[PDB]
Design a protein around this ligand. Sequence first.
Ligand SMILES: OC[C@H]1O[C@@H](SCCc2ccccc2)[C@H](O)[C@@H](O)[C@H]1O
Ligand SMILES: OC[C@H]1O[C@@H](SCCc2ccccc2)[C@H](O)[C@@H](O)[C@H]1O
Ligand code: NA
Ligand code: NA
Ligand code: NA
Ligand code: NA
Lengths: 409, 205
Amino acid sequence: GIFRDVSLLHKPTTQISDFHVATRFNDDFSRAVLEAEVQMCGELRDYLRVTVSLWQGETQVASGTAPFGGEIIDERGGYADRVTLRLNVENPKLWSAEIPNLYRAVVELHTADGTLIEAEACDVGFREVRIENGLLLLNGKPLLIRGVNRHEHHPLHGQVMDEQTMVQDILLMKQNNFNAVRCSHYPNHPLWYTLCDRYGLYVVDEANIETHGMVPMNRLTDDPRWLPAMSERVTRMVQRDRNHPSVIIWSLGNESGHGANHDALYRWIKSVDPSRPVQYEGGGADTTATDIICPMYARVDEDQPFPAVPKWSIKKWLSLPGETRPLILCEYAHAMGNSLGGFAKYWQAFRQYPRLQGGFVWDWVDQSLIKYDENGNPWSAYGGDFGDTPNDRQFCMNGLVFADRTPHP
Amino acid sequence: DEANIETHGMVPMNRLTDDPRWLPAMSERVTRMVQRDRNHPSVIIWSLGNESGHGANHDALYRWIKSVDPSRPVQYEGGGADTTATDIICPMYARVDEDQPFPAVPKWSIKKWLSLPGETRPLILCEYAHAMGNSLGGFAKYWQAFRQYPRLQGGFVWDWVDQSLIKYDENGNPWSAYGGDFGDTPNDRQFCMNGLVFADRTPHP
Ligand SMILES: OC[C@H]1O[C@@H](SCCc2ccccc2)[C@H](O)[C@@H](O)[C@H]1O
Ligand SMILES: OC[C@H]1O[C@@H](SCCc2ccccc2)[C@H](O)[C@@H](O)[C@H]1O
Ligand code: NA
Ligand code: NA
Ligand code: NA
Ligand code: NA
């Protein structure tokens, strides 16, 4: 059903069809340039302009006005409908989970006289996310990921998300020493990214692809005929959430095995957006479609010996011949019911081993639905309580908190 | 096969090995060894020495062996066992889980050492498990780690035989002497005996 908002948007005849925001930094991280690419749907003409200005509160730190037209990129020339505006920012505030420090950028298409045709705005965070010497870095500092996997779930409203529940979850996360959140395993609410920008939470944006039921798991993802469908699940996500500072990592999906489509889709994201590292778990979490090693529920010392896809110890995995990539557990420590036993082992290893930059806990909130007795009193329902078969019973509830949401011990 | 160079008593340990004037002496201790023992099949690894810190002479002497004999990898422990003068990481008595935090030359866990950013070389302990007297406690930990971790290709135990000398009582009966039993001072007492067997040579437990 229609589980997210429905809206009507009116645009002008000449519109800003698209705009991008990037941030480049000096090695001292004391000098930043904001290169903003702006696309328009025209209705193109010579006189109209585009002005991009950076605002810090009520103060404008920088601005840029330029006629449309791109630099020559081929023998045919450059884009006539596009324009590039790079703004110099001196000693800027850097975005992080610890210190948000958001910037406000206003992108407006206007005539040369001048009246503004359409005005667009975006929140800009100045940070850098790059893996260097096999270490995930934010602003030149190795970031230890203390994150948790989160499903968009409501016990009363299903998968419909209100603003109050998004805030409620974020506060509880930060109040329990969480700095990261992994929207698993689908693109979340557009407002969720906004909240993470201002509050300060590392976000791993995950594509809506998961073929866990197939045999083998990569039957569709290694099929060329299914490539067009998978690409649209990835490309459209990147185009929507590439402006958000809080998002630092792209994800191809979840459990979809390893196919040729993943490698192609991985290469595409790296091509369109070199700013964020791309991770993918399928194929043993050591495939060519991931910038980071992200094993699921891998253990600290003992390693599960499986054919084809072996799960190594998080300490052993790093030491494998030809390994340089860092290890961040996309999933670990199954918090189903009474759990997190030996949870201290993980975090002793996280702090000891440099390339072990933490992971994401599964899960944050129990996906339990509310039902009502004959007497009328409400009770938490799970798995096969709705007369559904075959089902996976209480396995739906693996959250660190209840659904109301009360914290588990 | 290990070269006859060790400057453990110097302060710092690389005072002579980082001295250009001492380079001619160190090279002759390395070059003449290689020329003599390069034909032997049993020798598989060259060694620059032992504890001599890390100097420019080591890097030059390392490069020389690689030049004359690319058949054998060259290892050297000094400088943190992760220097440019070694083909293999060979830490001394490094531990399996806990890592000794030392300035300049830090001793990491044998599991952690492999995972360090920019590490590709394998780890073979040139020395580990000090068999001084009643020892080899937690010796099973090393070999559990050796078999689990691919890049951990074991190591060399210290030591094989107790370096004890035989002396004689007034009655004539012989007794094992160590350290300062020969009226020598300053000495390092019973530390000379770290062998897996006695000197006769009877196996230790
Ligand atoms: O509890 C769900 C978990 O299932 C396991 S697989 C098999 C585990 C399983 C399968 C069937 C029923 C219950 C658990 C996944 O790896 C996790 O991400 C999580 O989804
Ligand atoms: O027992 C000798 C050992 O001494 C230690 S250093 C310092 C250890 C030490 C120093 C002085 C007296 C006794 C032990 C060396 O690293 C080993 O190779 C071995 O030679
Ligand atoms: Na770490
Ligand atoms: Na589950
Ligand atoms: Na091994
Ligand atoms: Na000794």
